[PDB]
Write a protein that binds this ligand. Structure first.
Ligand SMILES: Cc1ccncc1NC(=O)Cc1cccc(F)c1
Ligand SMILES: Cc1ccncc1NC(=O)Cc1cccc(F)c1
Lengths: 304, 304
């Protein structure tokens, strides 16, 4: 009973957080095995951020310039390399708390947990969706760079995000763990356009199924629609077009509740055209798109 | 930039979760030092839950009947005692992962993180407010009993909640770590009334300050009010009456933003009387009351 914006337990990730300092800039690093991963802008001063030549900036740095502290113990840096927008600092000690892990590049619309950190210390954890425009609407302040996003499948942590930058609009941009930015962003102090964003249709449908499972059913109606008809409504309301791939992943929720996907689409169509009329769904007065069909199944079945 | 429903990092609590089985009932326990705490209803069968005599039920149990498993290792139970609605199983081994901790009884309106668990394994973490009526609107299924609520101040975990029961309305009831229920609830399979709930006024005001800090300011107006006038509006809209104690704890947010508490009360009054007019505040289309003034200061300053 109940449905919450649940994050993964952050324990396995907390054991990997370190503080990385280079010159006068300090941020977070991720220590996995004998490598520490962090945003490459740790090598920059504020003046460098205007138009940085990272290759030239990194050349002025040696292993001893990167100070890596795991809690209260100092790591010895024996190598450094830049891969895309991340630095990889080889250390002489493998992290004893390294969980089983993978580096994954998630798709837009997928969700993950963020462990916000400052000075290598965890401050909090929250669940995010990677927006269709490849930004995240996180909660990050100066010093949070290097904080990571992740998912967990039983004992394996799949790291998918490393925080790098705050856009002038207050939304967030970052990379996968190979240092490739999600979206068009560059790690430079320049105003950068995020694409037009859209609402993640398949996620709103999954959340409507979660609402029905938990008893919030007032929005169910006597109607049905087609993918074509629904997509005309999705276009008008800036929702992602629904595809058969999306219908396919909603199958488990359709089977559990007995509500055909296109019937739920008709409820969503009516909610888009008429609003909530002052009512709520799962404690929300808007259509929530930060739960994937997998998240709904996982939470509604109590997967650990 | 940004403001999220952030939970504490759950790592220190994950290290304390164990599975407790007695007869054919399995639930979660909390292993701190050499004691395992769990809901006393682990000793009941479904038939016992109708009208249980816990004292008589516990008398039929011996130390060897309580099976406590921490991950994959078995704990040896050398004592058992019932304290209010919790069982305390003395074990022969102190939990090596015991963090610095305290047991606290929180007040209604205060917030905390829940680490939802099943079979002793963590499934997810979310931030909750203890409702003014002493229920929590959690996300819990069968097997989640024994999952705990907590806050963290630097290195100290203050445990404040242990999950026990789901009311017929789908809201949740539990105890402090001494086994005293929050609210009027009893651990019995009987329909039980939760009091009339109210919105946590001081928290909505704190969240309005968080919105102003992050740039959502459309709701600020040219008006002011008094505690008496605001409280007439709070009464009409089922909000908690605001006191000078509440105004006092909003002081840091009033000082940071330069918006006097009674001026923010006038914005809240107008929002109550006119609604959001289809607009949002911090990604919400309703007035959020699950962030305390302390949570707002902590998140807006990045406290670890
Ligand atoms: C101040 C802040 C707040 C939240 N998240 C991140 C930040 N910090 C930055 O964006 C620094 C920065 C500037 C320009 C490029 C870059 F890659 C990184
Ligand atoms: C089924 C479920 C779902 C979520 N949270 C909890 C539960 N389980 C219960 O309430 C069991 C129960 C019954 C009667 C009394 C009691 F103290 C405990």
């Amino acid at each position: 009973s109940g449905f919450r914006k649940m994050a993964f337990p952050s324990g396995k990730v907390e054991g990997c957080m370190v503080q990385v300092t280079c010159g006068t800039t300090t941020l977070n690093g991720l220590w996995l095995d004998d490598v520490v991963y962090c945003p490459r802008h740790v090598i920059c001063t504020s003046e460098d951020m205007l138009n940085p030549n990272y290759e030239d900036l990194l050349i002025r740095k040696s292993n001893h310039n990167f100070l890596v502290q795991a809690g209260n113990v100092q790591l010895r840096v024996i190598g450094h390399s830049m891969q895309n927008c991340v630095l990889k600092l080889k250390v002489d000690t493998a992290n004893p708390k390294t969980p089983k892990y993978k580096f994954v590049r998630i798709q837009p619309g997928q969700t993950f947990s963020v462990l916000a950190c400052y000075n290598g210390s965890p401050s909090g954890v929250y669940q995010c969706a990677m927006r269709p425009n490849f930004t995240i609407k996180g909660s990050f302040l100066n010093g949070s760079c290097g904080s990571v996003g992740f998912n967990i499948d039983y004992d394996c942590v799949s790291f998918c995000y490393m925080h790098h930058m705050e856009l002038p609009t207050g939304v967030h941009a970052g990379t996968d763990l190979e240092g490739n930015f999600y979206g068009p962003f560059v790690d430079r102090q320049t105003a950068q356009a995020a694409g037009t964003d859209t609402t993640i249709t398949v996620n709103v449908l999954a959340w409507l199924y979660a609402a029905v499972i938990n008893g919030d059913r007032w929005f169910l109606n006597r109607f049905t629609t087609t993918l074509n008809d629904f997509n005309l409504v999705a276009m008008k309301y800036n929702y992602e077009p629904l595809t058969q791939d999306h219908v396919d992943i909603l199958g488990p929720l359709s089977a559990q509740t007995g509500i055909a996907v296109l019937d739920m689409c008709a409820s969503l169509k009516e909610l888009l055209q008429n609003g909530m009329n002052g009512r709520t769904i799962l404690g929300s007065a808007l259509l929530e798109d930060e739960f994937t069909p997998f998240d709904v199944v996982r939470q509604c079945s109590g997967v650990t």
